[PDB]
Amino acid sequence: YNYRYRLFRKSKLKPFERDISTEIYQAGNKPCNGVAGVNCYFPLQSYGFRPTYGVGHQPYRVVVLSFELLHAPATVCGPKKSTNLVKNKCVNFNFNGL
Amino acid sequence: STIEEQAKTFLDKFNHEAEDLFYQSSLASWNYNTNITEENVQNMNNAGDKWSAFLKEQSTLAQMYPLQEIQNLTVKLQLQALQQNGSSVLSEDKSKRLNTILNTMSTIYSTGKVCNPDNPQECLLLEPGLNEIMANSLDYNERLWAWESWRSEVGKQLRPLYEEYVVLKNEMARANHYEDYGDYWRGDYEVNGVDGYDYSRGQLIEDVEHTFEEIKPLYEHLHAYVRAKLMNAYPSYISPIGCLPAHLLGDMWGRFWTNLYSLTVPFGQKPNIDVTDAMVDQAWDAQRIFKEAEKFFVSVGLPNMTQGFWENSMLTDPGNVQKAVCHPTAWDLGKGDFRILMCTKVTMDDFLTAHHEMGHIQYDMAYAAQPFLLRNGANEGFHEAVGEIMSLSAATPKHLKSIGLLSPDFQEDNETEINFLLKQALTIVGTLPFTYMLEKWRWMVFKGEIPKDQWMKKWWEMKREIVGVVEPVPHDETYCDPASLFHVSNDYSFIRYYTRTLYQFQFQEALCQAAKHEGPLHKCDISNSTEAGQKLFNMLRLGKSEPWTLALENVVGAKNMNVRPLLNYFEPLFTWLKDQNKNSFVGWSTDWSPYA
Numbered sequence: 103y104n105y106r107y108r109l110f111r112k113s114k115l116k117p118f119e120r121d122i123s124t125e126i127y128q129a130g131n132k133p134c135n136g137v138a139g140v141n142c143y144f145p146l147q148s149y150g151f152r153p154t155y156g157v158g159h160q161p162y163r164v165v166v167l168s169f170e171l172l173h174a175p176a177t178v179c180g181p182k183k184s185t186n187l188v189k190n191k192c193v194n195f196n197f198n199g200l
Numbered sequence: 201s202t203i204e205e206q207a208k209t210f211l212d213k214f215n216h217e218a219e220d221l222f223y224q225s226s227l228a229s230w231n232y233n234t235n236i237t238e239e240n241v242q243n244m245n246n247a248g249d250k251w252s253a254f255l256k257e258q259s260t261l262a263q264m265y266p267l268q269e270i271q272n273l274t275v276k277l278q279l280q281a282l283q284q285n286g287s288s289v290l291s292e293d294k295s296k297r298l299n300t301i302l303n304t305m306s307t308i309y310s311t312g313k314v315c316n317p318d319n320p321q322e323c324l325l326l327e328p329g330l331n332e333i334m335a336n337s338l339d340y341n342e343r344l345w346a347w348e349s350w351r352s353e354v355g356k357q358l359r360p361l362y363e364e365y366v367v368l369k370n371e372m373a374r375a376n377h378y379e380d381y382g383d384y385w386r387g388d389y390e391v392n393g394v395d396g397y398d399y400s401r402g403q404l405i406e407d408v409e410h411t412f413e414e415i416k417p418l419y420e421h422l423h424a425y426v427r428a429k430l431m432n433a434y435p436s437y438i439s440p441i442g443c444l445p446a447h448l449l450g451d452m453w454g455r456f457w458t459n460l461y462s463l464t465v466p467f468g469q470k471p472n473i474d475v476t477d478a479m480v481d482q483a484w485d486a487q488r489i490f491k492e493a494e495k496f497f498v499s500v501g502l503p504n505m506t507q508g509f510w511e512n513s514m515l516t517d518p519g520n521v522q523k524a525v526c527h528p529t530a531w532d533l534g535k536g537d538f539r540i541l542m543c544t545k546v547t548m549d550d551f552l553t554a555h556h557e558m559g560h561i562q563y564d565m566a567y568a569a570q571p572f573l574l575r576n577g578a579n580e581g582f583h584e585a586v587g588e589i590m591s592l593s594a595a596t597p598k599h600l601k602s603i604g605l606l607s608p609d610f611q612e613d614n615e616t617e618i619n620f621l622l623k624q625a626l627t628i629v630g631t632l633p634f635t636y637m638l639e640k641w642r643w644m645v646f647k648g649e650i651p652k653d654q655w656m657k658k659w660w661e662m663k664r665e666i667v668g669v670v671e672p673v674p675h676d677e678t679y680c681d682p683a684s685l686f687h688v689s690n691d692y693s694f695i696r697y698y699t700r701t702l703y704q705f706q707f708q709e710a711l712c713q714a715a716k717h718e719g720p721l722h723k724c725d726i727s728n729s730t731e732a733g734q735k736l737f738n739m740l741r742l743g744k745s746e747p748w749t750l751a752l753e754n755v756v757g758a759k760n761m762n763v764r765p766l767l768n769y770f771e772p773l774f775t776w777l778k779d780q781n782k783n784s785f786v787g788w789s790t791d792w793s794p795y796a
């Protein structure tokens with residue numbers, strides 16, 4: 103029960119917007135001032151992962167690797183690809199952009 | 201701010217919150233039923249109590265959304281199911297009274313019955329297994345002794361409990377706006393939503409009575425042939441011109457007529473189609489049986505069974521002395537945790553029931569996509585129908601030849617297939633009148649249609665009018681015969697059997713005509729016919745999310761209890777049997793008096 107997800111919200115979350123707060127959600131016509139009750143439900147719920155669940159309900163770890171480019175130098179790269187080095191030979195070379 | 205959106209949010213919460221409780225209860229029940237021991241026996245108490253309390257709280261809370269303004273049919277049906285509070289709708293005193301009555305019925309079922317002190321050595325003819333199929337041998341007087349002893353040991357004890365149960369349940373139904381308990385039962389088959397496909401609750405009785413009449417000649421001729429073929433346990437009071445006693449027909453109550461097989465098949469020279477010798481010779485075990493059964497559903501396009509089904513499910517070698525009830529069971533837990541409870545041995549019945557349980561599981565995983573209040577069969581008899589139609593198709597000789605359990609050179613003729621048809625007609629044709637008369641008697645009693653005049657005489661004359669069997673001895677009101685059956689003792693639905701029986705052959709004919717077959721239905725194997733599988737999956741997916749009329753019309757053309765497929769399946773048997781009945785007249789004397 104260490105994993106939780108939100109079930110009710112007033113408006114669809116904007117892209118990459120996050121709302122970690124746990125205020126009482128008012129789905130009804132009247133406010134409830136933080137008191138759980140009719141049409142005022144806690145907006146967090148627990149998965150309750152058991153280890154005999156099927157594939158459709160087993161806990162899947164999900165990583166969303168997002169790439170962001172803005173008006174700043176690209177400080178993260180993935181050029182983890184290098185060959186050997188030979189000398190005394192006329193060859194082509196690309197030394198980190200050279 | 202509208203009521204509809206509030207109800208949508210409430211149902212969105214409830215569907216998620218019910219899953220954990222249902223999984224807890226299901227896992228506790230499975231672990232207890234796998235092996236009876238105190239440490240997990242005690243778990244089921246709290247597991248059931250927590251689920252019941254959560255359901256009661258949700259049902260009480262669901263009241264503030266009125267049903268009038270609902271426009272979405274899905275949430276309408278969801279709330280209608282949820283607002284049907286059931287045993288929580290009435291006062292607590294009646295609740296504990298009903299709980300005590302259910303516990304007393306369960307104890308009566310569990311507790312055995314002992315014979316007279318002259319022979320108390322063995323009196324457990326029930327047994328924890330399939331041995332209940334065969335209770336007594338080819339007898340005439342001690343069989344009726346056993347019948348009357350069981351009836352006296354059940355009815356004289358359960359008559360007032362059942363009467364008070366009827367009274368309290370009628371009060372419950374009247375409080376819940378239904379006409380009676382029969383109204384509550386029929387409400388499962390009723391659809392009051394989409395027009396054109398609508399079906400009222402009062403139409404089921406007339407549909408059943410209309411669909412029963414088209415097969416009366418078949419049952420009449422079959423019963424006349426069986427009565428003429430008995431010839432050995434002759435009725436000592438009535439000449440074979442009249443009717444026949446009811447106790448001789450196989451089981452204790454005559455629900456199934458398989459036991460009569462060995463007493464009536466004419467062609468004893470031609471053996472019944474058996475694979476047991478090849479079953480043992482080729483070293484077939486439970487794993488091979490279930491793999492072969494799975495291949496059948498794989499061929500017709502249904503998905504590969506989920507990994508871990510065999511791992512979690514147990515099917516062989518109980519080992520522990522306190523063995524589980526070896527009756528077949530298919531368990532659905534949460535999502536994807538489908539499993540089976542089995543006691544496989546290499547026999548005819550186990551091989552036949554493997555496909556039935558596979559069909560159960562397949563229907564479960566087909567409708568698993570629906571919400572929690574909708575993942576179920578559309579009708580109360582849809583699940584057994586889906587199980588039995590797949591169970592009925594794999595037993596074709598062509599399928600056995602393809603598997604290799606039958607001789608490649610083995611030839612069929614007008615002598616073997618007629619025997620196959622007779623064997624499968626004893627277990628189908630005779631079951632319809634029993635279910636029909638039992639359910640109509642149930643509806644008459646629960647609705648107060650019958651007076652205080654002893655219901656036993658009405659039940660007897662009704663059975664002899666429909667089933668065509670006369671009771672062996674007269675009875676007074678002190679007995680209650682129907683409650684002796686498990687599904688009446690525990691108050692379970694019974695018309696699902698009739699619906700299963702008709703729907704099985706309806707979908708069989710539909711899928712077999714889709715299976716490009718020519719000739720009699722009973723020789724067609726739906727294997728490698730993908731169109732039939734797709735047609736069946738068109739209805740299996742919906743579950744309860746759509747009206748049952750839509751689930752029946754989208755595959756078979758008809759929308760109601762159309763019985764033509766059953767007769768089209770069993771016509772060769774009828775045509776062959778007419779020659780036997782050329783001299784054997786058809787018709788029973790309902791005015792028969794066994795006492796005279």
Ligand SMILES: *[C@@H]1O[C@H](CO)[C@@H](O[C@@H]2O[C@H](CO)[C@@H](O)[C@H](O)[C@H]2NC(C)=O)[C@H](O)[C@H]1NC(C)=O
Pocket residue numbers: 272273274275745
């Ligand atoms: C009723 O409410 C459902 C709830 O989502 C609406 O959404 C449809 O749900 C059904 C499932 O029963 C799907 O088959 C549809 O594809 C869904 N449609 C949409 C647009 O989401 C549904 O539209 C509502 N109305 C009706 C008449 O069902």
Ligand SMILES: *[C@@H]1O[C@H](CO)[C@@H](O)[C@H](O)[C@H]1NC(C)=O
Pocket residue numbers: 498504505
């Ligand atoms: C089903 O699964 C078994 C084992 O997991 C595999 O051998 C077989 O090829 C599968 N069949 C299909 C149709 O995926």
Ligand SMILES: *[C@@H]1O[C@H](CO)[C@@H](O)[C@H](O)[C@H]1NC(C)=O
Pocket residue numbers: 499598602725727728
């Ligand atoms: C169905 O397909 C399987 C696939 O190998 C085949 O072995 C079998 O003979 C086929 N059955 C029929 C009746 O065509």
